[PDB]
Design a protein around this ligand. Structure first.
Ligand SMILES: *[C@@H]1O[C@H](CO)[C@@H](O[C@@H]2O[C@H](CO)[C@@H](O)[C@H](O)[C@H]2NC(C)=O)[C@H](O)[C@H]1NC(C)=O
Ligand SMILES: *[C@@H]1O[C@H](CO)[C@@H](O[C@@H]2O[C@H](CO)[C@@H](O)[C@H](O)[C@H]2NC(C)=O)[C@H](O)[C@H]1NC(C)=O
Ligand SMILES: *[C@@H]1O[C@H](CO)[C@@H](O[C@@H]2O[C@H](CO)[C@@H](O)[C@H](O)[C@H]2NC(C)=O)[C@H](O)[C@H]1NC(C)=O
Ligand SMILES: *[C@@H]1O[C@H](CO)[C@@H](O[C@@H]2O[C@H](CO)[C@@H](O)[C@H](O)[C@H]2NC(C)=O)[C@H](O)[C@H]1NC(C)=O
Ligand SMILES: *[C@@H]1O[C@H](CO)[C@@H](O[C@@H]2O[C@H](CO)[C@@H](O)[C@H](O)[C@H]2NC(C)=O)[C@H](O)[C@H]1NC(C)=O
Ligand SMILES: CC(=O)N[C@@H]1[C@@H](O)[C@H](O)[C@@H](CO)O[C@H]1O
Ligand SMILES: *[C@@H]1O[C@H](CO)[C@@H](O)[C@H](O)[C@H]1NC(C)=O
Ligand SMILES: *[C@@H]1O[C@H](CO)[C@@H](O)[C@H](O)[C@H]1NC(C)=O
Ligand SMILES: *[C@@H]1O[C@H](CO)[C@@H](O)[C@H](O)[C@H]1NC(C)=O
Ligand SMILES: *[C@@H]1O[C@H](CO)[C@@H](O)[C@H](O)[C@H]1NC(C)=O
Ligand SMILES: *[C@@H]1O[C@H](CO)[C@@H](O)[C@H](O)[C@H]1NC(C)=O
Ligand SMILES: *[C@@H]1O[C@H](CO)[C@@H](O)[C@H](O)[C@H]1NC(C)=O
Ligand SMILES: *[C@@H]1O[C@H](CO)[C@@H](O)[C@H](O)[C@H]1NC(C)=O
Lengths: 192, 149, 423, 149, 100
């Protein structure tokens, strides 16, 4: 992750050898919403792509800091083998280097999750990771990760001539809660 | 993450740039007949002029004088002339006077640097200026009709 | 061409003050309703949107930390809100009931609605057609988190709901699933309308072939016309238009000397470029605020539609709804839910009378100086006799003391005719 | 369990978070030389402090407009929930509703309303079958050459 | 389906039959029921003619739209930190580089 000054085009990023199509007169490339993403060095003329010098798609999964202060890291839109290449562990701190590559990596549909291990038995979703997988803390002190149990698989014997009839009942009371209003907040012109 | 080091890369240009043949000619031209010199393939040192030249006004529009080192220009033109000492303040975008209306008008979308220095001993004599034009000039234009009226 | 709107074909009904028209034949048709459930969960970032990994831009945004805290919290709450919406519309029953071994339930074909057993997937044929109909800036920090419920679990939910409606009865949600044969299940679907239960047991093959023909016709209608599911494509187009509007608003300068910060940081000193970077960061913060507010409005509309779809599944799929024109144009409102990309598609099986016949009608019957009124149905009259029948079908029987009840006298009612009532 | 009434606490937390974020947005400068107007009015002349006070008042007006718009959206959502609660009280408390799974999981939908801080809480008394028994079934019965239903 | 013709007296009679009131009730005092309906129609017509506040919700909708448009044309009259509210004197008194 370096600061570069290419012909007066000051910027910050990671330069990678790329094969973008430039003209004989082009010196930098516009991409997305007018961002300099492909440039040409003036000495030994070639094409360099400016990747952003870290990964913006990093999510943090935690319980409360009054509970555990234990953390898990999710990387999206990428595999988990190229997590050291995308994150760039040559410059990040030593405590980050455990979560960049470790013993508890898990590739899923939404990237990979570091800090949690897979158990085959499924429970109710506590922390929604996304793409069908979930994480929890209840699961001697670790964050657990699993897939969602959509429900217990049941079967009914449709036997083409048989009915099942209830012979006894029960009465239960269910509670529903509905908001009605919020606080009537009035602001003033003066004193604000 | 945080940045570290510099990957400053500038073009392999070895020519030193002729400031003495554009700032120190034998006699500067008239204001109504100002010359324009295209400056090409050179290095903008701006440090050989820190001795024996006292710059009375160095005002840059669009860029800053503190950032002239960091930038490489695609092309540079230099319009050179000589005026009175009180009329230097008229060379700015969006302004009227004698020089800004009848001799030299600068455009509203200007991106450059006005650089003027007083020299009352190098140039001795008499010079000419236009003061009775019927219509004001368009920007970056020249007029040499002595008896148009 | 230019014209005036045809409000409709002008019709006329002969209100003849003593005549009724009674349907003598019926039909069953399946109607398709499409409802969106969620939109794409778009999360924007503080870094990499405004500041292209710039130190001075980040240093100035460190005076606007609470603004991006608001934006991130609001977008995360909207994403969690639509995960809750998708959970609430689909996950109502907890026990995932398996498919029956036979897809032919009393003559009604169900192979279109349920997935085939010789496949490892879960989406059915109609769901595959629906998925084929609907067709679906990261260095700016606009990331689309994936939905919490994947499409296979939603397909499992829809398969469980359709198999529960096929095997169980009205008690699919209330308590456990009580097994009921589908012929009697449809018979007591008819009995909760006004049509007498005997009707289904005379032409059950005709009803089943009508249901199969309607399923084939709606499958052909899904295959041919690519405009039936335009609401979901409108939702996806609105999200894409909002994101494209945001990345187009990123390309302006907002009164600064340039749209991009690189030439501003390169050409100007810090004391002059501070004002330009402040103007650009202010314009981009108001652009993000506009996007977040419009996303909140869109999520409110989608929440209203998702709550409507949840009410429709709680009333028309888990049971029979007696509301008029709530789930399809018809009388009984039994529906099958199918998944769709960010949406649900309901197939309502509705009952519509087709063929009509004119009769003359009196309200009461005077026998032995007493006025008898029908317990159910109206008193129709042929050219020779007087019969009583139900309102929604033509099945006449003789006037019997079991079918009528006595009330009042024979002079207190107007429009009465008189004959004998059988005992 | 202190989590059954979490929706009302979510509403109160949303209002408190909106007010706290408004008073947090009051602490910025919006491009002026300071966040507070006292040192701007004390250190600067009026002709220069006019622009700074204009920038601060523009930023605070946009913050108020954002707060009012988000309050309108929240009031729309709360209006929808209140209309749902009014329909529930008109259909399940004032009478018996025959809609399936509208007021509680069960068959009859007789409800008692209780107040709550900015909310209502309905207690539905629902009827659920419990014990089941298998039987064999035919739709019709043939007696004397006639089908009885 | 299509519109099936039904006489109005029986169609009221089966409106009561879908309530819990037995069908025989309307056939004893149909004139009383019809006169009650006519009196109620006359009373709601008189209530519409007299009180100008029964349809206040539509007037609130129209007033909200008019207030929004009036607030927009009132917000047009400010200067937003510039030297004037109108652009004509700004374009007339100032050069391009300052009035930009
Ligand atoms: C039907 O179920 C109810 C409860 O679900 C049973 O009522 C209980 O019966 C036992 C045995 O006498 C009592 O000890 C309990 O106090 C009763 N009430 C409850 C709430 O458990 C009832 O006996 C069942 N009836 C049949 C025929 O099975
Ligand atoms: C003062 O200015 C003079 C002329 O601008 C500089 O003189 C030149 O110095 C270089 C190297 O010192 C010589 O190669 C040139 O021949 C000199 N030019 C002449 C004599 O005309 C001098 O270096 C400046 N001194 C300082 C301290 O800035
Ligand atoms: C009632 O209408 C249905 C269709 O609306 C009729 O069923 C059709 O009958 C013809 C003649 O036998 C068959 O060829 C068709 O296959 C049937 N089905 C359909 C979907 O058209 C039925 O015959 C009618 N009954 C009466 C008494 O009119
Ligand atoms: C039931 O009777 C009405 C009354 O006749 C039919 O409506 C039309 O009435 C006009 C005059 O009243 C006749 O000239 C038309 O011939 C009638 N239409 C038809 C199609 O015959 C009404 O159509 C009758 N219902 C049905 C199903 O035919
Ligand atoms: C009603 O009968 C069905 C059919 O037997 C029961 O379902 C299971 O069926 C399999 C074979 O079809 C049997 O091997 C199981 O023993 C049955 N389950 C049980 C619990 O015995 C169904 O369970 C029966 N209903 C009840 C309430 O027992
Ligand atoms: C919300 C809550 O009760 N959190 C508790 C905390 O109060 C307690 O001090 C701690 C002990 O380790 O365990 C946790
Ligand atoms: C000189 O310029 C050439 C042309 O691009 C370049 O390849 C070479 O590396 C440069 N050499 C030095 C020493 O800068
Ligand atoms: C990495 O991801 C790409 C696409 O995201 C995929 O094609 C590839 O199979 C993945 N694995 C490896 C080892 O490259
Ligand atoms: C998951 O792992 C546990 C631990 O060994 C094992 O007992 C279980 O069988 C595994 N699940 C499956 C489906 O094999
Ligand atoms: C400019 O030229 C004059 C006359 O030739 C000379 O006296 C003076 O020293 C020169 N100055 C520079 C900076 O070259
Ligand atoms: C009307 O139906 C009855 C049925 O018993 C029949 O006897 C009678 O002849 C029919 N009349 C006409 C005109 O069709
Ligand atoms: C309906 O009105 C006509 C027109 O007067 C009348 O002849 C007829 O008897 C009325 N119907 C009944 C059932 O009274
Ligand atoms: C039957 O009705 C006719 C005419 O409506 C009437 O003349 C006759 O008296 C009635 N029959 C009896 C037994 O009242």
């Amino acid at each position: 992750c370096v600061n570069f000054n290419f012909n007066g085009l000051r910027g910050t990023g990671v330069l990678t050898d790329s094969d973008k199509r430039f003209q004989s007169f082009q010196q930098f490339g516009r991409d997305s919403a007018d961002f300099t993403d492909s440039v040409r060095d003036p000495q030994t003329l070639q094409i360099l792509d400016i990747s952003p010098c870290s990964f913006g798609g990093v999510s943090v999964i935690t319980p409360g800091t009054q509970t555990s202060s234990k953390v898990a890291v999710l990387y999206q839109d990428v595999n988990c083998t190229d997590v050291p290449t995308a994150l760039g562990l040559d410059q990040i701190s030593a405590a980050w280097r455990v979560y960049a590559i470790g013993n508890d990596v898990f590739q899923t549909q939404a990237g990979c999750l570091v800090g949690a291990e897979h158990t085959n038995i499924s429970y109710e979703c506590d922390i929604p990771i996304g793409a069908g997988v979930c994480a929890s803390y209840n699961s001697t002190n670790s964050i657990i990760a699993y897939a969602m149990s959509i429900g217990a698989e049941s079967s009914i014997a449709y036997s083409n001539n048989s009915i099942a009839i209830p012979t006894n009942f029960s009465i239960q009371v269910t509670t529903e809660v509905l908001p009605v209003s919020v606080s009537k907040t009035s602001v003033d012109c003066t004193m604000y | 993450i945080l940045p570290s080091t510099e990957v400053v890369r500038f073009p392999n240009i070895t020519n030193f740039c002729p400031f003495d043949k554009v700032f120190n000619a034998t006699r500067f031209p008239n204001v109504y007949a100002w010359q324009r010199t295209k400056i090409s393939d050179c290095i903008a040192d701006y440090t050989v002029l820190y001795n024996s030249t006292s710059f009375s006004t160095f005002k840059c529009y669009g860029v800053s004088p503190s950032k002239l080192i960091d930038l490489c220009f695609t092309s540079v033109y230099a319009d050179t002339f000589l005026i009175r000492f009180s009329e230097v303040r008229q060379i700015a975008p969006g302004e009227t006077g004698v020089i800004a209306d009848y001799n030299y008008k600068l455009p509203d979308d200007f991106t450059g640097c006005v650089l003027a220095w007083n020299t009352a001993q190098q140039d001795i004599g008499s010079y000419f200026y236009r003061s009775h034009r019927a219509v004001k000039l368009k920007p970056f234009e020249r007029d040499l009709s002595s008896d148009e009226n | 061409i230019a014209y005036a709107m045809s409000i409709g074909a002008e019709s006329s009904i002969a209100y003849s003050n003593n005549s009724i028209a009674i349907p003598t034949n019926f039909s069953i048709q399946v109607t398709t309703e499409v409802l969106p459930v969620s939109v794409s969960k778009t999360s924007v970032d503080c870094t990499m949107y405004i500041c292209g990994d710039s130190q001075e831009c980040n240093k100035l945004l460190l005076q606007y930390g609470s603004f991006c805290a608001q934006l991130n919290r609001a977008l995360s709450g909207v994403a969690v809100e639509q995960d809750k919406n998708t959970e609430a519309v689909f996950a109502q029953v907890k026990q995932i009931y398996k498919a029956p071994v036979i897809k032919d339930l009393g003559g009604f074909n169900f192979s279109q609605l349920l997935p085939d057993p010789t496949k490892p997937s879960q989406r059915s044929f109609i769901e595959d057609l629906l998925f084929d109909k609907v067709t679906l800036q990261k260095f700016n920090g606009l990331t689309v988190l994936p939905p919490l419920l994947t499409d296979e679990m939603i397909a499992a939910y829809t398969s469980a709901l359709v198999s529960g409606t096929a095997t169980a009865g009205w008690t699919f949600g209330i308590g456990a699933a009580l097994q009921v044969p589908f012929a009697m299940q449809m018979a007591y679907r008819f009995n909760g309308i006004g049509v007498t239960q005997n009707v289904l047991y005379e032409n059950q093959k005709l009803i089943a072939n009508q249901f199969n023909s309607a399923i084939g016709k709606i499958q052909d209608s899904l295959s041919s016309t690519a405009s039936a599911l335009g609401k979901l494509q409108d939702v996806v187009n609105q999200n894409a238009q909002a994101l494209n509007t945001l990345v187009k608003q990123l390309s302006s300068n907002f009164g600064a000397i340039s749209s991009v910060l690189n030439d501003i940081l390169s050409r100007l000193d810090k004391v002059e470029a501070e004002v330009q970077i402040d103007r650009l960061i202010t314009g981009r913060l108001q652009s993000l605020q506009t996007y977040v507010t419009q996303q909140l409005i869109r999520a409110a509309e989608i929440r209203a539609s998702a709550n409507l779809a949840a009410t429709k599944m709680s009333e028309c799929v888990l049971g029979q709804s007696k509301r008029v024109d709530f789930c399809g144009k018809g009388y009984h409102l039994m529906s099958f839910p199918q998944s769709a990309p960010h949406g649900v598609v309901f197939l309502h099986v509705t009952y519509v009378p087709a063929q009509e016949k004119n009769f003359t009608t009196a309200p009461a019957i005077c026998y032995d100086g007493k006025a008898h009124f029908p317990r159910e149905g109206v008193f129709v009259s042929n050219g020779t006799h007087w019969f009583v029948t139900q309102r929604n079908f033509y099945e006449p029987q003789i006037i019997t003391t079991d079918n009528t009840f006595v009330s009042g006298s024979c002079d207190v009612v107007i429009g009465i005719v008189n004959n004998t009532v059988y005992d």
